[PDB]
Design a protein around this ligand. Sequence first.
Ligand SMILES: *SC[C@H](NC(=O)CC[C@H](N)C(=O)O)C(=O)NCC(=O)O
Length: 107
Amino acid sequence: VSQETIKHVKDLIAENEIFVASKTYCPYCHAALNTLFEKLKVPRSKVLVLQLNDMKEGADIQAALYEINGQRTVPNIYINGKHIGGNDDLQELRETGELEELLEPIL
Ligand SMILES: *SC[C@H](NC(=O)CC[C@H](N)C(=O)O)C(=O)NCC(=O)O
C-alpha cells in the first residue's frame, strides 16, 4: 500500500468531523449509520461515508486503514480525527455514557 494512499486517507479523516469507511451490504455499517443519522441525529454534512465496495480505491483504502489503526473490518469510524472502531465500539461508548462528549464540538 502506497505512502500517498495513507496520506489521502489521513486527509479525509481530518477534513471530516465523522469519517465512516463502510460497505453497502454490511449490516454492521447499517447499524452504525443508523445510530449516527437517526438515533443521534448527526447532520449528514458532518459525515463522510465511503462505501469501499463501490469505489476503485476501496481495497487500498481498507488496507491503508489497517496500516493506520490496526482494524481490518468495516465500519471503521473516526470522530473528530479520533479513532472509534466498529459498530460495537460506537454502541459501547453510548452504554458507558462517553459518546455524548465526543459529539459535542461536532453536533
Ligand atoms: S459486514 C463486513 C465485516 N464487518 C464486520 O464483521 C463488523 C463487525 C464488528 N464487530 C463491528 O463493527 O461491530 C467485515 O469487515 N469483514 C471483513 C472485510 O474485509 O470486509
